[PDB]
Write a protein that holds these residues in place. Structure first.
Motif, PDB file in Angstrom:
ATOM      1  N   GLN A   1      -8.362   3.550  -4.816  1.00  0.00           N
ATOM      2  CA  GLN A   1      -7.234   2.694  -4.380  1.00  0.00           C
ATOM      3  C   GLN A   1      -6.353   3.493  -3.415  1.00  0.00           C
ATOM      4  O   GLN A   1      -5.930   2.957  -2.437  1.00  0.00           O
ATOM      5  CB  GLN A   1      -6.468   2.264  -5.627  1.00  0.00           C
TER       6      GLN A   1
ATOM      7  N   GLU B   1      -7.818   3.594  -0.020  1.00  0.00           N
ATOM      8  CA  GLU B   1      -7.669   2.247   0.557  1.00  0.00           C
ATOM      9  C   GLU B   1      -6.240   2.063   1.077  1.00  0.00           C
ATOM     10  O   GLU B   1      -6.085   1.512   2.138  1.00  0.00           O
ATOM     11  CB  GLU B   1      -7.979   1.242  -0.547  1.00  0.00           C
ATOM     12  N   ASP B   2      -5.258   2.507   0.307  1.00  0.00           N
ATOM     13  CA  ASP B   2      -3.830   2.384   0.691  1.00  0.00           C
ATOM     14  C   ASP B   2      -3.564   3.228   1.931  1.00  0.00           C
ATOM     15  O   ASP B   2      -2.887   2.782   2.795  1.00  0.00           O
ATOM     16  CB  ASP B   2      -2.931   2.622  -0.516  1.00  0.00           C
TER      17      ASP B   2
ATOM     18  N   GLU C   1     -10.673   5.262 -10.354  1.00  0.00           N
ATOM     19  CA  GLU C   1     -10.236   3.992  -9.724  1.00  0.00           C
ATOM     20  C   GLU C   1      -8.960   4.235  -8.924  1.00  0.00           C
ATOM     21  O   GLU C   1      -8.885   3.742  -7.821  1.00  0.00           O
ATOM     22  CB  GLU C   1      -9.988   2.911 -10.766  1.00  0.00           C
ATOM     23  N   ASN C   2      -8.032   5.028  -9.464  1.00  0.00           N
ATOM     24  CA  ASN C   2      -6.762   5.332  -8.771  1.00  0.00           C
ATOM     25  C   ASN C   2      -7.104   6.038  -7.461  1.00  0.00           C
ATOM     26  O   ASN C   2      -6.590   5.654  -6.466  1.00  0.00           O
ATOM     27  CB  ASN C   2      -5.877   6.277  -9.576  1.00  0.00           C
TER      28      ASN C   2
ATOM     29  N   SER D   1       0.819  -1.209   0.000  1.00  0.00           N
ATOM     30  CA  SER D   1       0.000   0.000   0.000  1.00  0.00           C
ATOM     31  C   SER D   1       0.856   1.265   0.000  1.00  0.00           C
ATOM     32  O   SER D   1       0.500   2.255  -0.647  1.00  0.00           O
ATOM     33  CB  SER D   1      -0.959  -0.004   1.192  1.00  0.00           C
TER      34      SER D   1
END
Ligand code: HEM
Ligand code: HEM
Lengths: 450, 446
Positions: free
Chosen positions: A199, A202-203, A195-196, A174
């Motif tokens: 993510q 989330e990371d 989408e990036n 991550s």
């Protein structure tokens, strides 16, 4: 008076010049063409890249310029928070954390980290001792496993166990992907980047969760280790009388992992690259390692005696400083070098690899790898050599990075002969840091026990 | 374990061995006989002479050894005071002057001294251009005229005008006579003492006068004196006081003039004794020095001339020794235990003849040995001392010597017309006494 500027792309000005996978190297070539200073314009952004010791020594005058958050650092701040590297000098948490953390990063404090650094260094040497004939070493990959695990153990007594894995610990996955997103954002937002963005969030959560859990676990247990987390849980800023809060402690730990791991592994990788490309230097460094490291485990004092290994590391940092730039802003209206008027708030970028190639300081042989340049540290003019930044905003991890790198390079040179079996062609991959991509060697053990 | 020692003279131990007019060369022969380390004892003095790179690389470890004032330096201190060369590392004035003077001795600072160096170098070239047929050159004599005038001009904008004189400037006469007394004391007088104090007074008065004159004028030059009057140590925030500025100037004249002129003299000696090397150096001078006056950048391009100078320093380093003391109990070379305060002498000319480093041809003059510094083992080559106590004048000495040797090789062909036999006179420094040549001009204008 009139400042040079590279080619433009209509409304986008200079910004498409950064849409390349080797932007520092591109900016170096621009500096080669345009000289010691050039303006770089983008939509809503103006900066000036400095390459000469003449101009950079003025930019390093702290009475006139303070650290600026580059766009790269601003994006890193989305997960490093107000940690030391991504906070402004005038933010309360910078000076607070600075005062608390400075004594735990001193040369004297490396005595306390030395045993844990040795723990990981021995794992690296054992991995290579256990390779089969005609297997090879992926150098930056193994250096990254080493520096990442060393910071984890010294930072908060946590073992990523990178030498037990092909796929890294979920935290590292991550973190690397968050750093990747930060760099990619610099070069770009339309619907495609959604989408990036998901993510990235989330990371960030993955990183916070593990670090917050370790902090919480440590507070509950009350146990004391020789790590930075223990110092941060117990330290008080003499000025405010305050300790760091749990959230900022998390940002510092994340900062140590980001700021330290890839810069340090890049240094080790470049150093080994230059060594196998310069066999006379390797022989000299290997002689010192064998003479100094007389015990199966190196001691703290022995590492300090590895003078020539230290010269190798400084010369590798001269040619390829792995944190390749830093940013400044003018505190008030001022004139740079007698000919460049700057207004309050104007931004400067220090292009470190170009500074380290300033022939008016280093002579004509700037591209040659000669650790002997550093044989006597006093021959180096002020602000000619800046791989660790400047002034009160310089790298707090400098002694840590150099102690680890000296220890590990010393052990590598003591325990193995190295072969550049592919005649490797230097290929410098760029993230926010620099590394020699695909650098591989073979190691033949000298059969010296640990 | 047991350390060799040369022959003794009863109660006088080894001291009568120094009562010779070539003591460095005598110590080299002792090292030839006894090897890499030998004890040297005198009444109230014990030291150990090191000759091998093996042991000297350990002696150069600054965590274990610091600079010691040899008996020679202690006697020089009576007129160099706490200047840089005769002060202990722990004296406040050492680090202070070190921090202040280091930027004015850098490679970058040589750009500012270059014009004054050329001024004196042109005077040397013109002297030789104006010689009549079958006249010859007294090489160390003329080299000393040059280096002495170059330091005077770059140090404090003062012209000794040595090329206008047979008898040296009164300051130089007292300085030389003070150095002579310092060396003679090592080998041992009420008149010597009265004379020694008179010569100190001559040196202090002239230097104190130039400092006062410069303070009164307020004028700024490109010299070391201006830097010392205006500089502040970044650490303490203090400037040097006027007394220490005097000691630094005296130190520059002492430490720089005879070492550098010896280097030029030995370099020209080895060149005329090695005509293939001379031709190579002369070819570089003609290719590089394309202007009537050399530029700073051109001097940096005289690579082979620089190698010539390094090889001359290898064979006959003109500051031939330095002294160290053990900071703590330590073991040298795994077999020689030393107690805290124990003294070492580094015999540089013997170090530079270590066949395990340089090969069997150690006595041959081959500048090519210096093509790559990385191929030279650590601490094998120490003509300028070691570490933070290394020669602060190294870049000055090499820039001057490269410039002057380059111009000499551009403007003249040289003949060893007497087939000169090397005779090395020893003061506190080394020089080829009686070295003479003839120069035939290539008729290239300035
Ligand atoms: C060879 C390896 C390293 C290099 C070349 C390097 C380089 C740098 C540079 C250039 C800066 C200043 C950046 C700026 O002004 O924007 C900096 C700051 C910093 N570095 Fe490093 N670094 C290295 C290793 C480390 C390590 C191992 C750590 C932690 C253990 C670390 C932690 C930090 C921190 C916290 C800062 C911010 C200090 C402050 O502003 O208060 N670095 N580093
Ligand atoms: C080829 C010419 C020269 C040689 C071989 C030489 C050699 C040396 C050596 C061996 C030392 C260390 C002595 C010790 O450790 O006791 C030294 C120190 C010193 N030299 Fe030179 N030198 C030369 C030219 C010069 C010049 C031109 C200057 C001044 C302009 C100079 C000024 C000094 C000073 C001030 C020190 C003491 C530095 C310190 O300890 O802070 N030297 N030199």
């Amino acid at each position: 008076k009139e400042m040079p500027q590279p080619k433009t792309f209509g409304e986008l000005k200079n910004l498409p010049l950064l849409n390349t996978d080797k932007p520092v190297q591109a900016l170096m070539k621009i500096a080669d063409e345009l000289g010691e200073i050039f303006k770089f314009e983008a939509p809503g952004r103006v900066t000036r890249y400095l390459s000469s010791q003449r101009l950079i020594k003025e930019a390093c005058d702290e009475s006139r310029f303070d650290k600026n958050l580059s766009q790269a650092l601003k994006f890193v701040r989305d997960f490093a928070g107000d940690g030391l590297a991504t906070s402004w000098t005038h933010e309360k948490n910078w000076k607070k954390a600075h005062n608390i953390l400075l004594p735990s990063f001193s040369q004297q404090a490396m005595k306390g980290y030395h045993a844990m650094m040795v723990d990981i260094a021995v794992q690296l040497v054992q991995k290579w001792e256990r390779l089969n004939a005609d297997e090879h070493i992926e150098v930056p990959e193994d250096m990254t496993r080493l520096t990442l695990d060393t910071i984890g153990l010294c930072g908060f007594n946590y073992r990523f166990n990178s030498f037990y894995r092909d796929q890294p610990h979920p935290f590292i996955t991550s973190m690397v992907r968050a750093l990747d997103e930060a760099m990619n954002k610099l070069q770009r937002d339309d619907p495609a980047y959604d989408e990036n963005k998901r993510q990235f969030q989330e990371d960030i959560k993955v990183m916070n969760d593990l670090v917050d859990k370790i902090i919480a676990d440590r507070k509950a247990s009350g146990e004391q280790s020789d790590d930075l987390l223990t110092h941060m849980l117990n330290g008080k800023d003499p000025e405010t009388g305050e300790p760091l809060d749990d959230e900022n402690i998390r940002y510092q730990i994340i900062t140590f992992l980001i700021a330290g791991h890839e810069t340090t592994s890049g240094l080790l990788s470049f150093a080994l690259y230059f060594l196998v490309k310069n066999p006379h230097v390797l022989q000299k460094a290997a002689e010192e390692a064998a003479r100094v490291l007389v015990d199966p485990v190196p001691s703290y004092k022995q590492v300090k005696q590895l003078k020539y290994v230290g010269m190798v590391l400084n010369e590798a940092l001269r040619l390829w400083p792995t944190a390749p730039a830093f940013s400044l802003y003018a505190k008030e209206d001022t004139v740079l070098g007698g000919e460049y008027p700057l207004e309050k708030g104007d931004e400067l970028m220090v292009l470190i690899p170009q500074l380290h190639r300033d022939k008016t300081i280093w002579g004509d042989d700037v591209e040659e790898f000669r650790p002997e340049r550093f044989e006597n540290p006093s021959a180096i003019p002020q602000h000619a050599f800046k791989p660790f930044g400047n002034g009160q905003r310089a790298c707090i991890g400098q002694q840590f990075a150099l102690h680890e790198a000296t220890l590990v390079l010393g052990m590598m040179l003591k325990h193995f002969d190295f072969e550049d079996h592919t005649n490797y062609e230097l290929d410098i991959k760029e993230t926010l840091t620099l590394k020699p991509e695909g650098f591989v060697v073979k190691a033949k053990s000298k059969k010296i026990p640990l």
